[PDB]
A paper describes a structure:
To gain insights into the structural organization of subgroup III Schlafen proteins, we employed single particle cryo electron microscopy (cryo-EM). The full-length SLFN5 protein was vitrified in the absence of nucleotides. A 3.5 Å cryo-EM density was calculated, giving insights into the overall domain arrangement. A majority of the protein could be resolved (residues 3–684) with exception of the C-terminal ATPase lobe (residues 685–891), which is likely due to its flexibility. The data was acquired in the absence of nucleotides, suggesting that the missing density of the second ATPase lobe could be due to relative flexibility between the lobes. The N-lobe of the Slfn core forms a second large interface with the linker domain, including several hydrophobic (Ile57, Met89, Phe98, Val479, Tyr514, Pro515, Tyr518) and ionic interactions (Asp87 to Arg487). In addition, the loop connecting the Slfn core to the linker domain (residues 335–366) holds the two domains together. The globular linker domain exhibits a mixed α/β topology and connects the Slfn core and the ATPase domain. The highly conserved SWAVDL motif (residues 424–429) seals the hydrophobic core of the linker domain and interacts with the N-terminal lobe of the helicase. The N-terminal helicase lobe is anchored to the linker domain by an α-helix (residues 561–568).
Numbering used by the authors: 3 to 142, 169 to 498, 512 to 684
Write the structure that this text describes.
Amino acid sequence: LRIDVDTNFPECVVDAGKVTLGTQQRQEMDPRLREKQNEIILRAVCALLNSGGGIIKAEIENKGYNYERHGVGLDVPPIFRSHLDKMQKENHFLIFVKSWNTEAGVPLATLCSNLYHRERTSTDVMDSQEALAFLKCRTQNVSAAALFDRKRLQYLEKLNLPESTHVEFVMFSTDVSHCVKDRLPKCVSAFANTEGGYVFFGVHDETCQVIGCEKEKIDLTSLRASIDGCIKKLPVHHFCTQRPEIKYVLNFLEVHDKGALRGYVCAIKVEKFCCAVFAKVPSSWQVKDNRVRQLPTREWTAWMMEADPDLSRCPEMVLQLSLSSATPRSKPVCIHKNSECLKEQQKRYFPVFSDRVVYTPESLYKELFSQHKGLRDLINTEMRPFSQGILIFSQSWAVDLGLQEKQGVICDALLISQNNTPILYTIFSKWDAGCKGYSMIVAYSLKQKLVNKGGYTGRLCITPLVCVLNQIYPESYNFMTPQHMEALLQSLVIVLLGFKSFLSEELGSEVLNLLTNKQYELLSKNLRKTRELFVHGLPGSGKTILALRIMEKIRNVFHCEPANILYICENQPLKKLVSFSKKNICQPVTRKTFMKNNFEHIQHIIIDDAQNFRTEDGDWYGKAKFITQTARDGPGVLWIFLD
Ligand SMILES: [Zn+2]
């Protein structure tokens, strides 16, 4: 497996190698290879069901395959069929995967939980719903023993002990060691998860007759060694404090025949473990570092129980995107009770009514049309066929996500239109070799933010097109309702207004929040048009929540470095919260070290709460305006979040 963005689709094109398709062709080939390819494809599907959906290519080995005649041939878990959409190109099978929709409670998509469990007679793996319930419940035999201590066991002595919740008979295979190592994780996991029961290797399970193995190949020493190894190597988890170890006991019940010993019956007694025990790491995957990565048992078990954090501590908050109706990688979104919900923000920033085609930014489309001549003609030409939708403009859409603005890009237009794929229009003053690259990367990052961060469950593709002002998805991906583009815009409001809140990242895992109208206004303002601004006093964290994003914008637009964005803030909690952040935004230095040091290379400066600047320290405004105006490249930006 790998991850390829080189494909025309602006998505996560997992290259799953070459498969051999066709049901009959599946039946008439190597079953080992069939299972290998099926497992690889399901690996890729489980990877894309978490990461945010994408594509799976496959170089078909079958010459003359046809998706209408020969079928597919893939054996797929039943829950992994509501998401896959298959397709064929002349020599490439494609499988388009949407998100996971956190359907039926389970947060992430799992192939198999590998949390075995023993029912009345059989050891079955807990499905994802059972495993989630089982973790949620652990977080919040005298007769078989008498048999266990028995010394003499004669051949074919029919045991009075029947298979039950606490016993299990497993006959010996050809290789006793290989078979016991293959079966021990299973039964040990089963017993530890359940009330805890014994297991006897070497005795038939239905007739319950002592058989054992021949002594010529078995060695009790190496057997016990391998058993304790493969029993302590089991990936376990622990919701408790002591963190004990798997407390088992092993015994070799003797085996006699006509008064002559001929083998043993490996009797293993596993006690009820206080925490979950796996047979190996869960078979769940994701796409990380642009490759496939198996979620670690600790992260798997802390993700399956990543319930929406209890907002009972702060009864003033209100939840708006629960993780029970979102994607795997989404986070909840709480808003103050008085601040507007997600629905009002959607209907205010991106209205939807089918009588015409409107523009989300009236002032951005207007100023762009009053400045550039011909932009109005190009937009009215491209926007002519579509009758219902909304065209949204942004001085450069790559910046509103977090990417890096390019040179020679007039503006970016996204059109949300029902009954057709949403279309991204990127308008260039001049054609070059970066048109396609920039458009595809902006569209790909936009879809990723809409799915992962925004939490869009249904199918979503953003079609990128470039126009110099001077592929094909299946029918499923084409919108079909006016009640799903409403979901797309309720997710876009989150993508363009969501920030990782600081108030509640102590209240749980992590909880996003929504900027007000004034903060998004002051953020959307063009920097290359306004390199100097004095902001009215912002109540509460106004300036901080805004500055932490204005600095990312400053780094992206001006191609500046984090080391050239000075952040002059006084309060020490602000200093630690901004500096010790993992993203390395700026250099928070107080007013004292501001005027007690020389900044030779600082280009952009953002000041916080100039109301506390003492005059005896020095006339800060002159020095600041000097160091910005005389910056290395051009007049630097100067934002003073005074009150
Ligand atoms: Zn424990």
